[PDB]
Enzyme design. Sequence first.
Site, mmCIF file in Angstrom:
data_model
loop_
_atom_site.group_PDB
_atom_site.id
_atom_site.type_symbol
_atom_site.label_atom_id
_atom_site.label_comp_id
_atom_site.label_asym_id
_atom_site.label_seq_id
_atom_site.Cartn_x
_atom_site.Cartn_y
_atom_site.Cartn_z
ATOM 1 N N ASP A 137 32.396 48.856 35.282
ATOM 2 C CA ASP A 137 33.400 47.891 35.636
ATOM 3 C C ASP A 137 33.330 47.590 37.116
ATOM 4 O O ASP A 137 33.908 48.322 37.931
ATOM 5 C CB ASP A 137 34.805 48.445 35.221
ATOM 6 C CG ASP A 137 35.954 47.463 35.474
ATOM 7 O OD1 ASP A 137 35.689 46.257 35.666
ATOM 8 O OD2 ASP A 137 37.146 47.902 35.490
ATOM 9 N N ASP A 182 32.425 40.431 38.009
ATOM 10 C CA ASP A 182 33.170 41.434 37.248
ATOM 11 C C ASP A 182 32.541 41.709 35.919
ATOM 12 O O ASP A 182 32.760 40.964 34.955
ATOM 13 C CB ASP A 182 34.633 41.000 37.052
ATOM 14 C CG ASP A 182 35.495 42.085 36.424
ATOM 15 O OD1 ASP A 182 34.998 43.203 36.202
ATOM 16 O OD2 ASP A 182 36.682 41.818 36.155
#
EC number: 3.4.23.46
Lengths: 374, 374
Positions: free
Chosen positions: A34, A217
């Site tokens: 992440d 992201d």
Amino acid sequence: FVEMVDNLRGKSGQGYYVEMTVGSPPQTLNILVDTGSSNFAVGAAPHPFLHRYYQRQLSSTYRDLRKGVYVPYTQGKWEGELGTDLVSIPHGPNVTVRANIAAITESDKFFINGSNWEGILGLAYAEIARPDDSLEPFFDSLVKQTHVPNLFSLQLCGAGGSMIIGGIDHSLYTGSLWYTPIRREWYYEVIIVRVEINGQDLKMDCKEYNYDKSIVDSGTTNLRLPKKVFEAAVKSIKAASSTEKFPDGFWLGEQLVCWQAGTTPWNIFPVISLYLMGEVTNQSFRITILPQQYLRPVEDVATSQDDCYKFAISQSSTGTVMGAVIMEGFYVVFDRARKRIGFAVSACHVHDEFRTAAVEGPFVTLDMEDCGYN
Amino acid sequence: FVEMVDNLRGKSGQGYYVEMTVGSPPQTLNILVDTGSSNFAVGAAPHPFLHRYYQRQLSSTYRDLRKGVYVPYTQGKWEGELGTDLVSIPHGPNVTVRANIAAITESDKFFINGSNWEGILGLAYAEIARPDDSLEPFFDSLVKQTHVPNLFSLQLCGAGGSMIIGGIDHSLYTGSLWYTPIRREWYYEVIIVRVEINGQDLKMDCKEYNYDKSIVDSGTTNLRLPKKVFEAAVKSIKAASSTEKFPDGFWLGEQLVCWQAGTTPWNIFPVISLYLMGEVTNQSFRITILPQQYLRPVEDVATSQDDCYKFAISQSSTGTVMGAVIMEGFYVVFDRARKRIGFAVSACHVHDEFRTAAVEGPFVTLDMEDCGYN
Ligand SMILES: COc1cccc(-c2cccc(CC[C@]3(C)CC(=O)N(C)C(N)=N3)c2)c1
Ligand SMILES: COc1cccc(-c2cccc(CC[C@]3(C)CC(=O)N(C)C(N)=N3)c2)c1
């Protein structure tokens, strides 16, 4: 780095994960990669969705930090206990570090029922660490405690993929890497300076493209675009793809769209180009994404039996998000040492014998700093 | 209507629900009251979070419509099978109707682990019904098939509450009801024409307050405000409450804020007034909400032991949402017959011996139609 090639599994739909070990003796866990968060957080109680969880009692090296975290998200939360322990990546660099770990003791709408990972590897910077910027993120620790150079690179496939810790692997991309500055070290914030649809710019103030943020992201599925830019963006692709017709709800992610095996024509849909601030004053480069990227197989629907894709662009109050669906076209280098992010054409992106994913430059773009929101 | 008083349970945190029966013989279910959607959708398989689910096999009156729905949300989805059956509300009007029912066969991040309801009663209009506007919503059916007048009213307490189907109950409010037009029958869309914080208007273009929408939604917890208005809104309350200090993350719903029993001072926080388009040209009225409404007890945190509230305002790509936390201050009348929504002070809102929730008018406001986005 042959060691680390193909060390990721998953898909933009459910996330990409890497195998990690925590504690002594090693407890193996699958952990979401992440780049949009900064906590190393692992399931540590028997939530029924979970395959595996961290059992601190079984680890000689665990150390309690006698402090709890409560972590709300738009629609998800978790709660846990802070500590440290010894962490390793089997298919990463051959080192072992003492990292902060949030033992997740309670959560809602966080873990995915049916998924094969049990935690989150937050790879962004200290500033957005919970509870505060004094909780040192895993990657900072890894760099602090070993000689691993301060960078990593991601090739997300879902054509799993590869995370190369400490370097770059030439087998994962083609052509040249072009670099955009990391505007500030919190999220992996960048500046989009121009956007073209098929080959024509939305011609809107570039400050809009980055209102209030633009970020890269790996833990967001979609390309997310600000309200005002999403409006314009969709306006142009909608009109671009006026051959066939699709419902209003589709564009707002409210219903899926379907065709038969083979009958999805990419070619009604325009390629999309995002121009990113370059390394040099008045210089930019551009990344070009295919319809395959913005229209993603929604794998299983029993209420249909067609090639049903979901429109992988959506709007945001919190900015542009370049997600897994964007990253899947590119080899992406998070060159933290030099405050920059490199993009190249991914050796595993999915391409017809027509168009392709492209990374091109230099272009001349004036007043690029004015594109950032302050 | 004494019958229907107190016929709701729940809280802004997890939702308000009413008991319904479906099928012959009656199967009892707890069903979320959702003015923000238009499908009657019930859990129909043994998802482990669920207390109860609809078993179509046990109902003589069930009829399959041989059609499936797939229903994605920002972070939630469900999938189900469409049919009709006989539906009743024990503590509602003494009638029974044949309603569409989506039997939910699959879902992710939809049902809440630990909640006591098993379905959704979508009370908005046909336009936003899935899969299309030809699936007749429960309330349209109820009105079509019986003599129940075309309106309902909600008093959400969480001081449960009351849903009065077919009328209004004077015991549930004080003072007078003031009415704002339903701008269009899809969501329960309204027009906010001015906003004051403590007693001072954000002085921004009112078109912003309704970009692209403003709606009343019993199935959203928070007051949600557009990016641009959320910025300004928070700017003013943040500065309003500069006595004490709170982190940046708090205002973005990223961390909770805590005080000890009694030590939360409401009075650092300003009352908020939303002025709504009135029934008459150039006339408006206003609704005033207390800090108790925008700061909600986050009930249990084991990582703390304090009065820890979450900031109940947040931003949106999809508009203003007047949620449960706003509605809890008011008796709200969804007067569908007259395309208008009535607000009065709720007889169950929570108030100190200082300030209060208020509904006041008339005010003179020019050019109110210009406040709506087209
Ligand atoms: C491709 O990555 C995916 C796809 C689908 C779901 C996830 C996912 C599921 C559960 C938790 C998270 C992590 C969320 C967060 C810590 C906070 C947040 O809102 N974002 C977007 C990020 N990046 N990390 C992801 C990731
Ligand atoms: C006060 O109501 C609450 C509080 C917390 C959660 C819910 C809730 C939980 C699961 C599903 C839903 C229904 C969602 C939806 C069909 C779609 C959507 O995004 N919204 C906001 C609405 N209104 N209905 C609600 C409701």
